[PDB]
Amino acid sequence: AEKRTLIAVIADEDTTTGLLLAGIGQITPETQEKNFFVYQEGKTTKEEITDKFNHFTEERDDIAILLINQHIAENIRARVDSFTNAFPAILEIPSKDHPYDPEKDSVLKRVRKLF
Amino acid sequence: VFPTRMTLGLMKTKLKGANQGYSLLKRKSEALTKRFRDITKRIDDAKQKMGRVMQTAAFSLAEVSYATGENIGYQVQESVSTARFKVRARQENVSGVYLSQFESYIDPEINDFRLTGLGRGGQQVQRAKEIYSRAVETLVELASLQTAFIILDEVIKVTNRRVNAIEHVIIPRTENTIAYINSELDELDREEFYRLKKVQEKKQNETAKL
Amino acid sequence: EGMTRKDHGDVSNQLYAKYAIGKDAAAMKAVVGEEALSIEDKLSLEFLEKFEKTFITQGAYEDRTVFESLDQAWSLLRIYPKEMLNRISPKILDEFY
Amino acid sequence: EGMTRKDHGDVSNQLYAKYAIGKDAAAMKAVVGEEALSIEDKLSLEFLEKFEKTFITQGAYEDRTVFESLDQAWSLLRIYPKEMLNRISPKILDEFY
Amino acid sequence: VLRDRMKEILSNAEELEQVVQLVGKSALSDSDKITLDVATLIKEDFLQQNGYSTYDAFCPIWKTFDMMRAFISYHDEAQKAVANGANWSKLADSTGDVKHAVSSSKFFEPSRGEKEVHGEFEKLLSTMQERFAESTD
Amino acid sequence: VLRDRMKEILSNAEELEQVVQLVGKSALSDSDKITLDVATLIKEDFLQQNGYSTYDAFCPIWKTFDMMRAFISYHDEAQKAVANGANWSKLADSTGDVKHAVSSSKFFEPSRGEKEVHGEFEKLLSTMQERFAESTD
Amino acid sequence: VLRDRMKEILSNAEELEQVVQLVGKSALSDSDKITLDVATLIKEDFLQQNGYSTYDAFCPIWKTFDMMRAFISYHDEAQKAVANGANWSKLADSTGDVKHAVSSSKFFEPSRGEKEVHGEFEKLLSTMQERFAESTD
């Protein structure tokens, strides 16, 4: 159970900034590696998001819940779908100025088939 | 090949083991999918609800970032070195299976970060954090069901395979094996009686003629 | 009547069906646990233990006349509401729960 | 004990119980999945193979000392805690293990 | 009285074992776990004995009764203890000292109390009662 | 060496095949996934000797040896390649054409190369070795 | 014609019930739901009897004929209308009086139209047609 109490973020810069101010993530004091990843839309390559994905899910283990923007999650669709674990939780929420889509939501796809 | 002489007794109990498993496991399966459905409708709504809240808090924060004439987010990244909103984990029995549940705590031993006092620009950040702490709490409390959901999704798939397997394979194997052995078995008892009767007939003939 | 009652037939249907369901409930309880079980299954469980331990169980020198038996039956069945009792005519069900 | 040891009868008794569980755990392993496994059983699955392929196996020309046989028994048993043992009196065990 | 309870512990264990084999354990009631545990004790002390019990040359009725009496008392206190609230695990950990003591019963021979009634088992009942007190609160 | 390796490939295949049918192939690892696949090829190619040729019906002692050797070299190389980092699906895809060629080998006459020991089987050894380097990395 | 179509509706339904169990009702269309209803009627009207009236006690060839004619007639129009822009829920609320009437035919006399050809059915064809105009529109 308890061995994890950070919420990590893959989101647009404003959303992330806000979330941190509110206090969820951190820049660790003995790894000196962020436990959040900011994204400049369209200006950041799809390959850099993927490294960061691996980082929160696997290369870190203190991540409880992994938050991820629908716009961003779609770009790296392959890696998200392949992640099916509950440790950390994958919870896709709408991106900033983007509406809900059931098909940018990895878990909802999974659930629908084989009900 | 399986033992011919009185396997019947063991093989009957195999059937009773199998049988008990179909009913019980089907009850268990039935109950998990009944729950699963309930969660489905909750999770679907909760995604839409989080999205609205996250976009509104994000836009108020964005407006402020632009008005002050400096990017607040850089200031914010140095100061973040703790997290106010954390989770504490619990395992909860939802049916026989343990699912992950989370209950959120806000550290009251954690002060406000210093990103205020910037002048007129500082007022703007000060109002901004207050809407956002409220908003962020939403995302986490709703998120507790998701982790339980994903697990629930994996376990039901395994429990579903097991019912199908016992029903199709296991039970008919117990029927066919039982039957094969029965057919040989009854014949050993019957032929004996015929053997006895044939020898006795010869005997009766000899004895009668005296 | 006169060595039975009219209400004898309807009751025979309620108790058999509820009992069967009680056995099924015992197996489910072991699996799900006590703190994760259904209401309907919980009732069926309660019935199993009382049914066994009161109706079937009687002492060596205790005579159970048919009139006596039928009363003990209504106490057991009472735990279910009227909503879950239905293989019984509402006439009876209103007389004796 | 004069041409064997006193533990010869105890050390044999332990190895049957563990081998028996390992064999049932194997059958269950196929049908349901790894869902019915428990800590003791996983250990028992390994024990089965370990025993089969080291203990029982030997060359045609090979012959074996009884005292030797007994150290190889102990060795296989060394992968289980002592609290899980019970077909050996705690006195006997303490001396040879 | 002891006969009925002896029967009940053995009886429920066989049915719960069948659910254990097929479904597995991921859950098994607080009460159900207790029954299994205590039934192991009965196997080990009674059912197993033939050159494994250092006293077995003749065993009196009183001694048998006294031994079983400790097992049954441990059972009722334990099931009550989970229901009035106290975790199953806290309950195993606190019973501790006495639980071993009943596990070890089988080697013990009449040498205390009477010539057929044994003091170690009589002592045991009262200490059990004290364990329940620690365990519920 | 080939007699011991032949028994071993079939024997492992049998145990795993029960686990796949009832439980799923989800429990199994990629090396054991391979075990089923190499073994399947041996079923279709060896056992089937009805043919429509006298080359698919007569397999000399030498023709039988080359075939078995080629197939084991595959299995050993295959368990390693997935072990130092490759998939059952990925491995299957890379050999691909080279796998068909070993299946269809049996149809080919034995009277070529040295005697029944063809150059067709000898070159095939090198192509497996090469494939191994690709598969792993 | 009527009889082959009757066998098929009961067969197809069984399969559609299995889906209700596993997935539920969130993967079934208006047309599949309609199959279920027709099947329930066939079963109700024919299979269930108990001597409710002196019309269950004896039934002629004609009454048997009129019952199934009514069920197929509804089946084709109803499925057609959901294809053309209607809902099972819609079909249900409007059908109301005509649909209860066909279910209850078994209590009533068959002697309504003539003397053994049933009038409760003959009028139904006209009402079901009229029903379908309203349903599509």
Coordinates of C-alpha atoms in Angstrom, one line a residue, chain G residues 38 55 96:
Chain G
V38 CA -41.8 -11.9 -29.7
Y55 CA -60.3 -22.6 -24.2
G96 CA -50.4 -1.0 -25.7

